[PDB]
């Protein structure tokens, strides 16, 4: 009965494609024709941090938009002070291979993990005066790629075992498992209301999971190669992604399809990281062309360039107050812009 | 004007000094990457030198080496292969008892990131390979080969086949056999040559 069910699956795919085509009334260009262009913008470096001796792989901002955190292959985790460029902590690491970092919303915890198949949590408010490892999470079978904090008790991870998980810090047990992907996954994005999250794998497909139920609700397939970055729109009803084929796309969770694409003839190298501004009008994007870029999220047109890095950028993030964007390459230098 | 930010500045300076001291003191060790196919004898020569990534540390002639074994995980190799860039050399391994190894070597040799890193190739299990050759011909693996059924000719033919899989003249390939704990001397010679070349290049003379 394998052929019968295969034909039924093909019929269902045709039916859903027909439904999407029927619901596809008009594109975004016609609606956005009357939008006033934002115009060219220019940004100048306002600070530079010099304390790393190797490549930089990940970073994360803070809730109060003053304290940073960075990770490097040298095995050192450093918590920075953006305003005075000072240093507040320096955390040695068990393994030098590190791929991700995250800062807890309450400011009490920091998480990190890499090729050791373990996510570590550090307590930064110990009575003894130092920082020690609260607990280590070990339930994955592949290298970790991303980590996020829900509360001071729940963490969501995304390994390279074609799965995403939801943990419980107090007891370190797998609360819920997310399955359905067919390849390595490296992305995450927690919704502003903290009830849904979407991830992008190497299959050029993305899924909009459900935190409470645990069952995926939608799937998007519109790219040509692997996926490297993702970020929810500030409103909470859209998201954007960057792929290895040197083109970004903006999807939707109501029309269940694409809206617009950001393409250029000269751009050849792949995308490294993608993020939105405070009002969602600007779509910051990293690159392998030794520079960053600014895309007008509505008109899908070029608006500015943020150059000044010797090597390709590997991370990106804007402040919660929306006043500064921070980038980091493998040349061990982080630039705070404005 | 600072009231008690001076204590913060002092803490920052102490942290920076400790970081610089640790960074300077940690550059005296070189790193080595182990590659090859499954069950290629890499663990054999790793143990004879006395779950994601397994590293080994040992010292020899006032110099401490660092070994890394990566084939313990099954994922996209191109996803994490960039993490091992800027490594001194690659210690490949080949077992003369089996085309998978040749394809892997052809893939890794022409990679963009490893276009200049030297490669050390360790043909392994000489005795049983020679016994099998003297007992059965190698025509099953290489029907296009020709020559006698002796030992030296087959080894030379296989070495030529492995050597002909490179394209960049800049890279230098070192070939040695094994199977008496003398591999440390060969590794030391290769790393000394690499270090001398790097020192000459850094001064602007090379």
């Amino acid at each position, epitope marked *: 009965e394998l052929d019968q069910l295969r034909q039924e699956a093909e019929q269902l795919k045709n039916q859903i494609r027909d439904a999407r085509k029927a619901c596809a009334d008009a594109t975004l260009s016609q609606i956005t024709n009357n939008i006033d262009p934002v115009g060219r913008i220019q940004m100048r470096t306002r600070r530079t941090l010099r304390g790393h001796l190797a490549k930089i792989y990940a970073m994360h901002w803070g809730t109060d938009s003053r304290l940073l955190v960075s990770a490097s292959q040298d095995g050192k985790l450093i918590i920075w*002070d953006s305003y005075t460029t000072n240093k*507040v902590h320096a955390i040695p690491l068990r393994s030098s291979w590190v791929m991700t970092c995250a800062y807890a919303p309450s400011g009490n915890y920091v998480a990190c993990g890499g090729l050791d198949n373990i996510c570590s949590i550090y307590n930064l408010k110990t009575r003894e*005066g130092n920082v020690r490892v609260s607990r280590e999470l070990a339930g994955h079978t592949g290298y970790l790629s991303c980590c996020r904090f829900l509360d001071d008790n729940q963490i969501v991870t995304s390994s390279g075992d074609t799965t995403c998980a939801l943990w419980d810090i107090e007891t370190g047990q797998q609360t819920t498992t997310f399955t359905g992907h067919t390849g390595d996954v490296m992305s995450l994005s927690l919704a502003p209301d903290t009830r849904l999250f979407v991830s992008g794998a190497c299959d050029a497909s993305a899924k909009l999971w459900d935190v409470r139920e645990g069952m995926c609700r939608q799937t998007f397939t519109g790219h040509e190669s692997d996926i490297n970055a993702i970020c929810f729109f500030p409103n909470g009803n859209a998201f954007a992604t960057g792929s290895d084929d040197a083109t970004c796309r903006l999807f939707d969770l109501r029309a269940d399809q694409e809206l617009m694409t950001y393409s250029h003839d000269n751009i050849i190298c792949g995308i490294t990281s993608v993020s939105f501004s405070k009002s969602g009008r600007l779509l910051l994007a990293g690159y392998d062309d030794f520079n960053c870029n600014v895309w007008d999220a509505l008109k899908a047109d070029r608006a500015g360039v943020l150059a000044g890095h010797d090597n390709r950028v590997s991370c990106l993030g804007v402040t919660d107050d929306g006043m500064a964007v921070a980038t980091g390459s493998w040349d061990s230098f982080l630039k705070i812009w404005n | 004007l600072s*009231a008690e930010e001076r204590a*913060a500045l002092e803490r920052s300076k*102490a942290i920076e000094k400790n970081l610089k001291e640790d960074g300077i003191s940690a550059a005296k060790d070189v790193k080595l990457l182990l590659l090859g196919a499954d069950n290629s004898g890499k663990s054999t020569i790793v143990k004879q030198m006395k779950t994601g990534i397994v590293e080994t540390h040992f010292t020899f002639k006032n110099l401490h080496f660092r070994l890394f074994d990566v084939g313990g995980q099954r994922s996209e190799r191109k996803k994490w292969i960039h993490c091992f860039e800027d490594v001194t050399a690659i210690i490949f391994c080949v077992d003369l008892s089996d085309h998978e190894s040749l394809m892997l070597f052809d893939s890794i040799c022409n990679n963009k990131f490893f276009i200049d890193t030297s490669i050390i190739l360790f043909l392994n299990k000489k005795d049983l390979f020679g016994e099998k050759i003297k007992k059965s011909p190698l025509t099953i693996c290489f029907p296009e080969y020709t020559g006698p059924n002796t030992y030296e000719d087959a080894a030379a033919y296989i070495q030529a086949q492995f050597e002909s899989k490179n394209r960049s003249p800049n890279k230098e390939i070192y070939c040695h056999m094994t199977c008496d704990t003398n591999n440390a001397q060969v590794i030391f010679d290769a790393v000394t040559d690499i270090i001398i070349a790097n020192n000459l290049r850094g001064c602007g003379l090379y």
Partner: single-chain antibody
Framework: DVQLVESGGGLVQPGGSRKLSCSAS????????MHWVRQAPEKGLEWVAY????????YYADTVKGRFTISRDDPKNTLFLQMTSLRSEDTAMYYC??????????????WGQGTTLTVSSSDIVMTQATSSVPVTPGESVSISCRSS???????????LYWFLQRPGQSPQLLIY???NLASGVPDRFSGSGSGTAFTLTISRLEAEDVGVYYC?????????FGAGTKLELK
């Protein structure tokens, strides 16, 4: 648990000498500061010395400059004080305290037990208006502590700390930077004020709040405490 026990004090005839040690155990001594605080037998607390982390910097008071010596030994985690040429008006009690500084830190969090010394025969000034007030249980009362200069630094935040000493033991920290609650303090205490006029508000009293309240300052060396206001039941 964190411990800070002092020893060395006793009976000293005039013109003698003595050595003190306030041994530390139970935490990371290397990254912390250290102070010595003196309280007269029937008066308020007073500040004496200071030493940084790693012995990088030292400070001293006016009346003790050139007569006291302070030393630290990191491997043993001990603090030393050298009493040379003790005068006739130097009998008091001495403690040692923890003074870590960074962004968002809470200095003076822990205090020692204390030892008694017996002898034979442009500065900022802080004052407390009242001395003793009767408070009925279950009510809400407020206190005042007026300084002589604006404590508002350029960075935006001001430096005013509130200390409470119950009758019988060493003081405990209540509020740092005039707005932040220390760990282990109930949420019924509050801090308010701006520039020079400072105050502390407490409501829903209990029996354990009887004691004396001292307001300190940390803008610039030297540091000056307050006289001390007593609270009594009924």
């Amino acid at each position: 648990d964190v411990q800070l026990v002092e020893s060395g004090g006793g009976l000293v005839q005039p013109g003698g000498s003595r050595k003190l040690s306030c041994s530390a155990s139970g935490f990371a001594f290397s990254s912390f500061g250290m102070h010595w605080v003196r309280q007269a037998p029937e008066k308020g607390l007073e500040w004496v010395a200071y030493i940084s982390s790693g012995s990088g910097t030292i400070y001293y008071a006016d009346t003790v400059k050139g007569r006291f010596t302070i030393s630290r030994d990191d491997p043993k985690n001990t603090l030393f004080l050298q009493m040379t040429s003790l005068r006739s008006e130097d009998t008091a009690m001495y403690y040692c305290v923890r003074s870590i500084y960074y962004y968002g830190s809470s200095p003076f969090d822990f205090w020692g037990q204390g030892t008694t010394l017996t002898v034979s025969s442009s500065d900022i000034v802080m004052t407390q208006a009242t001395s003793s007030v009767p408070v009925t249980p279950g009510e809400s009362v407020s206190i005042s502590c007026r300084s002589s200069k604006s404590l508002l630094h350029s960075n935006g935040n001001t430096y005013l700390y509130w200390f409470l000493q119950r009758p019988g033991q060493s003081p405990q920290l209540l509020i740092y930077r005039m707005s932040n609650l220390a760990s282990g303090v109930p949420d019924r205490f509050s801090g308010s004020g701006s520039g020079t006029a400072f105050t502390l508000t407490i409501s829903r009293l209990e029996a354990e709040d009887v004691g004396v309240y001292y307001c300190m300052q940390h803008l610039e060396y030297p540091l000056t405490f307050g006289a001390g206001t007593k609270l009594e039941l009924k």
